[PDB]
């Protein structure tokens, strides 16, 4: 029974660790699922719930009452939906003759609505699965309460060690992965929403992201973070209100409310994720975890290169052999997407490949200057692609069959589903050969991720010791040459002796 006892002990340890996982994620799941349902089913009640949650995430003091109100509102919604499911209600559609004009199925005119249009209409056909979503939300809230109660019961009843082993470093990252990486993660979330939407709203996001980048010292970020969080929550609320209540495609492009085409609300969830990260990062950014906190001698562990441990080998791989991987990724991103923006990628890759050694020899100042130049170019191309996404709506009307070179040059094509689709235009041959697989964003984003990671490496002391090693190698090269000459001389003497002996034997 010793094996059974060991399994029971492992299960108890896993359960003890869990409560900790539930504290960070339980909150993330409750904020995320309600917003997902609210965007899935637009409603006035959903709008109120979303607004309350949106305010709750950036500010902690509003969390208690918001959590209290969540279950009340969800119970109210469930009860009122079951009440209106009895269909005891028993309830102008004037089509235009010839300002917005359309011919296909709409919602104002071409369909009968039992309320007016400005409020979401709820009717339960199945009457069982049509109210399941709110029930699931209530169940999740109950689970969260149960978790808190269990924690209360366990309250009443019942880093410097990183470098020794790889498992210790793994534990440290699991504990504080977000502590030192939150800023980069929220930057990546911003580019994620920008790539996903390709609307006018994400143009606003990108302009604000460049404003964040240009103040690259972290104290300016400290000054400007609360304003960004307030802007983000107000913007999300505004977008939800706009969703609830001239070519058709162009109208779609700008985020606006049209009965015939309604801007997708599923995409918004991605924007919400960005706010969550920013809000979470902000509390950490403010908190610093100061209650934990977990050139003579600023480098306690200079000797990664020697490699006495497994973690040392992984460390040297990260701090020494990742710059060239960055260069390879830059080249791949430039070459795979044949638009004229990867030509800049190719040129940058060539120059960096040629001068990487002397760049590493340089002090951090010029290195970060050039690296910031590269990152700025990358974000510029991503913003330019999102801006030229406007040439996806007023595209068929003009660009096709005229100014074809323009489209081939900048690789104009739509990648979002909120338009017609790729791989259909080629059916008609308008003598333009639309590049369908060409335009994309994932490679630019991944290059952005690698650039930020390398920039972080440059700031770290570890690179500084590696640079010292590079200086030493640059000094040695001449001695290496002389040793090579000595080896060649020894070999040639050996061969001469063997040949002479053979000739003597022949004689
Ligand atoms: C099926 C699909 C699978 C897909 C898998 C994908 C896997 C992706 C993995 C991505 C890993 C990315 C690792 C990034 C590590 C960044 C390290 C880094 O930036 O360190 C730098 C920082 C420096 O400290 P600071 O507090 O900033 O210093 C104060 C500052 N300088 C000041 O003056 O104010 O912080 C530090 O110095 C901390 C140093 C930590 C060293 C940790 C080394 C980790 C090595 C990881 C190796 C991974 C190997 C994986 C092998 C897999 C094989 C199958
Ligand atoms: C290598 C940069 C890659 C990203 C940007 C360009 C990508 C394509 C072209 C790549 C050419 C690389 C070879 C040219 C390198 C010149 C040397 C480089 O180090 O210049 C440094 C920095 O020069 C700049 O990086 C010039 C970069 C040229 C391209 C800038 C592109 C920026 C984004 C917008 C592009 C818009 C194109 C047009 C759109 C309509 C200056 O060195 P240093 O004297 O030690 O530092 C001075 C710091 N000061 C100024 C504060 C005193």
């Amino acid at each position: 029974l010793d094996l059974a006892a060991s399994f029971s002990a492992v299960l108890t340890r896993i359960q003890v660790f869990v409560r900790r996982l539930l504290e960070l994620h339980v909150f993330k799941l409750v904020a995320l699922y309600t917003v997902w349902v609210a965007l899935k089913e637009v409603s006035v009640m959903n709008l109120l719930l979303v607004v309350l949650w949106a305010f709750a995430l950036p500010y902690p003091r509003f969390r208690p009452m918001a959590s209290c109100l969540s279950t009340v509102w969800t119970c109210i919604i469930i009860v009122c939906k079951m009440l209106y499911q009895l269909k005891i209600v028993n309830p102008n559609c004037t089509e235009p003759f010839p300002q917005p004009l359309e011919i296909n199925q709409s919602l104002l005119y071409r369909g009968p609505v039992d309320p007016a249009n400005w409020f979401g209409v709820r009717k339960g056909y199945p009457n069982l699965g049509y109210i399941q979503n709110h029930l699931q939300i209530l169940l999740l809230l109950v689970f969260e309460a149960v978790v808190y109660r269990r924690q209360e019961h366990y309250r009443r009843q019942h880093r410097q060690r990183l470098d020794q082993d790889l498992l210790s470093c793994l534990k440290y990252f699991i504990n504080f992965f977000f502590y030192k990486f939150g800023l980069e993660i929220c930057f990546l979330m911003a580019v994620n929403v920008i790539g996903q939407r390709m609307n006018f709203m994400v143009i606003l996001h990108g302009c604000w992201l460049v404003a964040i980048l240009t103040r690259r010292r972290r104290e300016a970020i400290a000054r400007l973070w609360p304003n960004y969080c307030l802007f983000l929550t107000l913007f999300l609320l505004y977008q939800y209100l706009l969703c609830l209540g001239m070519n058709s495609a162009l109208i779609k492009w700008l985020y606006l409310p049209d009965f015939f085409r309604a801007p997708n609300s599923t995409n918004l969830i991605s924007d919400f994720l960005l706010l969550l990260c920013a809000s979470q990062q902000w509390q950490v950014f403010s908190a610093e975890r100061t209650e934990e906190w977990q050139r003579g001698e600023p480098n306690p562990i200079p000797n990664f290169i020697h490699c006495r441990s497994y973690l040392d080998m992984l460390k040297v791989a990260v701090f020494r052999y990742l710059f060239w991987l960055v260069l390879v990724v830059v080249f791949v991103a430039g070459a795979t997407r044949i638009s004229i923006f990867g030509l800049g990628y190719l040129l940058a890759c060539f120059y960096l490949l040629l001068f990487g050694t002397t760049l590493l020899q340089k002090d951090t100042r010029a290195q970060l200057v050039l690296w910031d130049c590269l990152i700025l170019y990358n974000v510029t191309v991503i913003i330019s692609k999102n801006m030229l996404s406007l040439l996806s709506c007023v595209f068929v009307e003009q660009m096709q069959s005229n100014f074809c070179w323009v489209i081939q040059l900048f690789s104009l094509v739509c990648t979002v589903k909120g338009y017609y689709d790729p791989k259909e235009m080629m059916t008609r041959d308008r003598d333009c050969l639309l590049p369908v697989e060409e335009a994309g964003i994932i490679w630019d984003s991944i290059c952005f991720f690698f650039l930020l990671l390398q920039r972080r490496i440059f700031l770290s002391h570890y690179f500084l010791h590696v640079s010292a090693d590079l200086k030493a190698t640059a000094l040695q090269a001449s001695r290496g040459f002389a040793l090579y000459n000595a080896a060649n001389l020894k070999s040639i003497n050996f061969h001469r002796q063997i040949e002479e002996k053979s000739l003597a034997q022949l004689k």
Side-chain angles (χ1 to χ4, degrees), residues 4-5 9 30-36 38-42 53-77 80 83 91-122 124 126 129 145 154 159-197 199-296 298-507:
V30 71
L32 174 58
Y33 184 79
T34 44
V35 184
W36 160 261
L39 274 299
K40 198 72 166 184
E41 304 167 349
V42 55
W53 274 103
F55 272 73
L57 279 296
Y59 299 80
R61 314 147 281 158
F62 294 66
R63 148 68 179 68
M65 24 219 252
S67 72
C68 178
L69 295 168
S70 73
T71 177
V72 174
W73 210 245
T74 192
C75 182
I76 291 297
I77 289 184
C80 192
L83 180 64
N92 314 337
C93 64
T94 57
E95 286 78 358
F97 277 77
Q99 290 208 5
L101 72 164
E102 75 271 21
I103 309 172
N104 190 359
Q105 195 59 254
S106 164
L107 214 64
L108 276 171
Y109 302 166
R110 323 300 179 81
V113 59
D114 54 291
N117 299 111
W118 280 28
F119 173 61
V121 296
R122 62 164 180 172
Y154 290 106
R159 211 172 194 180
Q160 281 45 50
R161 61 168 309 186
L162 184 151
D163 301 298
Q164 289 80 16
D165 208 24
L166 73 164
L167 260 62
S168 69
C169 175
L170 185 137
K171 290 279 191 171
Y172 167 79
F173 276 146
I174 288 191
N175 290 10
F176 304 95
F177 182 76
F178 202 90
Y179 182 41
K180 302 301 291 184
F181 285 158
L183 199 74
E184 283 61 5
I185 298 296
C186 66
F187 280 38
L188 288 184
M189 282 316 178
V191 65
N192 169 30
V193 69
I194 289 189
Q196 284 284 8
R197 294 261 281 281
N199 296 334
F200 179 90
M201 302 303 94
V202 290
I203 298 300
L204 171 60
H205 272 357
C207 188
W208 198 230
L209 183 55
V210 174
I212 300 299
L213 277 191
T214 188
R215 314 191 187 198
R216 61 187 183 272
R217 275 81 61 194
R218 294 188 81 254
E219 72 272 358
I221 301 314
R223 264 88 55 80
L224 260 66
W225 206 245
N227 295 324
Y228 171 81
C229 280
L230 207 53
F231 164 88
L232 195 45
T233 178
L234 290 193
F235 187 85
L236 171 53
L237 181 158
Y238 178 77
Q239 278 194 333
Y240 204 78
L241 285 191
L242 214 52
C243 174
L244 186 149
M246 301 85 75
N247 203 17
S248 64
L250 189 164
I251 299 302
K252 172 57 175 302
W253 197 82
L254 290 62
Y255 194 80
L256 288 171
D258 185 315
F259 302 78
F260 171 58
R261 305 199 69 171
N264 181 344
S265 302
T266 304
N267 296 349
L268 283 184
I269 190 167
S270 308
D271 197 301
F272 171 70
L273 260 173
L274 157 65
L275 199 148
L276 158 67
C277 288
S279 64
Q280 191 167 0
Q281 189 275 331
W282 182 50
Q283 65 183 357
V284 173
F285 185 111
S286 44
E288 288 176 353
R289 289 280 286 165
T290 176
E291 58 87 18
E292 294 293 334
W293 265 100
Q294 196 168 297
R295 179 143 293 102
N299 188 357
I301 50 171
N303 71 345
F304 301 21
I305 60 176
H306 292 87
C307 295
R308 72 203 42 75
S309 66
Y310 269 50
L311 166 66
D312 280 302
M313 297 191 339
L314 266 64
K315 279 167 154 203
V316 66
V318 175
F319 287 102
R320 185 179 178 85
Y321 293 170
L322 194 70
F323 176 86
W324 314 108
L325 189 46
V326 166
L327 291 203
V328 170
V329 160
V330 164
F331 179 91
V332 165
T336 303
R337 303 281 87 92
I338 306 92
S339 78
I340 190 167
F341 289 109
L343 190 150
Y345 282 161
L346 294 196
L347 268 295
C349 177
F350 292 167
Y351 170 81
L352 268 296
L353 204 66
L354 192 47
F355 286 74
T357 65
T358 182
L359 192 146
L360 298 187
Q361 309 290 355
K362 287 184 185 296
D363 44 349
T364 62
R365 280 287 295 103
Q367 302 181 352
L368 67 91
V369 167
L370 193 140
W371 215 239
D372 284 331
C373 173
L374 181 59
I375 294 185
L376 183 153
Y377 169 89
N378 191 3
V379 65
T380 292
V381 311
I382 193 65
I383 289 310
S384 190
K385 276 177 187 175
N386 179 331
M387 187 151 291
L388 273 296
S389 177
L390 182 142
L391 271 298
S392 160
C393 65
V394 54
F395 169 75
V396 176
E397 160 177 322
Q398 181 70 254
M399 296 279 24
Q400 274 161 351
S401 304
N402 198 17
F403 304 151
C404 183
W405 60 249
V406 170
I407 183 178
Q408 297 278 328
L409 199 75
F410 301 88
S411 170
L412 278 301
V413 73
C414 200
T415 55
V416 296
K417 65 172 66 171
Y419 290 88
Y420 46 98
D421 64 350
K423 188 176 182 179
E424 65 86 16
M425 295 294 182
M426 287 70 79
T427 55
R428 72 204 66 154
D429 189 14
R430 298 194 173 188
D431 197 0
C432 196
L433 183 62
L434 180 77
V436 296
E437 82 283 12
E438 288 299 309
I441 301 299
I442 170 169
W443 281 118
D444 290 25
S445 66
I446 197 168
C447 167
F448 187 87
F449 154 62
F450 270 125
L451 261 60
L452 276 296
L453 180 54
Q454 183 57 261
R455 193 273 191 175
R456 195 63 180 182
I457 302 302
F458 278 65
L459 277 286
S460 66
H461 301 275
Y462 308 74
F463 169 69
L464 188 155
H465 79 66
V466 168
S467 64
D469 211 10
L470 273 295
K471 318 272 185 178
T473 285
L475 292 189
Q476 302 184 25
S478 178
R479 271 294 325 287
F481 165 64
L483 184 155
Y484 181 85
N485 288 315
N488 279 21
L489 260 184
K490 180 176 180 183
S491 177
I492 206 70
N493 284 356
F494 176 99
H495 275 271
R496 297 303 180 181
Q497 305 307 356
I498 298 297
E499 189 277 331
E500 185 145 334
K501 292 181 209 91
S502 180
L503 195 167
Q505 187 50 17
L506 183 163
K507 171 40 54 172

